[PDB]
Subunit: 66 residues, 6 copies
């Protein structure tokens, strides 16, 4: 029962540590878990524990990796 | 006078569970059924319940698959 | 004199059911008749009576054919 | 002495009927004269007197054609 | 506390008439000297006074030519 | 707990002078140290001490190298 389903769904991905693919508007993808989100970006961690700050305006979609 | 037709037309697609193609600004398409929308995204599900969060700013168009 | 010429010009295309080309920021175009507009999208109906919701932010230009 | 030089410069291009190239974010260009502008778009006319509504958010730059 | 550094750094480029490269989101670059900026655009002039209006939203980066 | 994690994380990179890769929406990357940020841009200084103003709307991601 959420009025902000995009935010709620990303907060579930954070809590669950769901592996995701983030397709960027470059056509390329990142893969990892989302550790935080705000109105401008998200924090992604990858399989080597490398941190990335992703701009939300650069994201096409977020889909589970597995 | 019939405001918010973009929202309302997507809500009809949700209600009817209409299979759609979503063309993204990358030139690639996604296929599924829309389950929700908000100001920033929509939730697209495939044939077996995997949910993708699509950013609206990344969408070129939404059309039923025919 | 219309102070909202983008809106006015699209409204004339809707009223007249003028066929158009819509060039998208993907570089590809759609062809059809515009049926409605709002601040986020427009409704394009092609020749197969396929209804498409086009995001305005994704449009490069609209030209009557 | 304008606080809105982008708008003022486009209004000069309109008044002067200066031929321009409009480079779009697709990488492709349009060529013609600008007949009107607003906060969302501009109206371009081309050498065959074909009218085009251009979205400003799709424009990379506007430069004189000659 | 030093706010508006993007604006102020471009104003320094204007003041000094610094030749720049402007990389656009199309992947192509423009070259010239910046003469003005506002909220939506900047004016770039080449070696012989032709002025191009560059939309800021279409800019990836601005850097001096070296 | 910071309520502005995008800003906070970039600020840590500025404070620590951490070298980064900035992937742009052109698909190409820049490499350097971030010196400042605001709501529209950041200042990236590369190894040649070339200062670049990068528009934030043009950034895909930033990652420490």
């Amino acid at each position: 029962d959420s009025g902000l389903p995009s935010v709620r769904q990303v907060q579930l991905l954070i809590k669950d540590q769901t592996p995701v693919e983030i397709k960027l508007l470059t056509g390329d993808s990142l893969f990892g878990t989302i550790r935080w989100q705000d109105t401008d970006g998200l924090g992604l961690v990858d399989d080597s524990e490398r941190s990335t700050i992703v701009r939300l305006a650069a994201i096409a979609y977020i889909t589970p990796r597995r």
